[PDB]
Amino acid sequence: MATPQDKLHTVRLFGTVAADGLTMLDGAPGVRFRLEDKDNTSKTVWVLYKGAVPDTFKPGVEVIIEGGLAPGEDTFKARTLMTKCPLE
Template identity: 50%
Template sequence: MARQSPVRLVFAVSIAAALAVFLLYVSVAGGTPSLQPSQLKNRTGKVALVGKVVQPVRRTAGKQEIRFRLRDVKGSAVVPVFYRGSVPDQFKLGREVRLEGRLRNGVFIGKPGTLVTKCPSKYEAEKRA
């Protein structure tokens, strides 16, 4: 059996290490930070907004447009949201949602196709009155 050249081994390990570093960088740098309404102030750039849907919810007739307000999951800060795109069936008042977009003139403009509802877990303990 012929002995492999150490140069080939060093080259292969170097390529594997470079690929691992590149994949790690892409996964970390490409992420969109998730924020709640209270964390949006003076924020520029694309972010993911997470919160609970509160009143009022207004749908534009004949269009896939919706206006609503999001409140912090555990807090009182609220931000108005405008979203154009398909709305999940589970979208309703009190439901936690996540969507990507940007804050413009005090209104969060959602990117189409990014509105996702958080479904309540059937394993959570029921709230008792």
């Protein structure tokens, strides 16, 4: 009998945005892209973010996403997005 982590512990994931497969929602606000894991750069997870995608969001910008990869779903549903490098 122990006290575990909170049930609604959302999944904060870290990596960099690729140019390869940076595919936005066709006629809808959002973006699908492969987040290249910095530990293993062949571990490319297809992150799907809905809503206003920042101008600072570019292919090559290291981003912090938050959401979750559902058992059965092939895309990580990011409910929030955080970009580090601005328009440079």
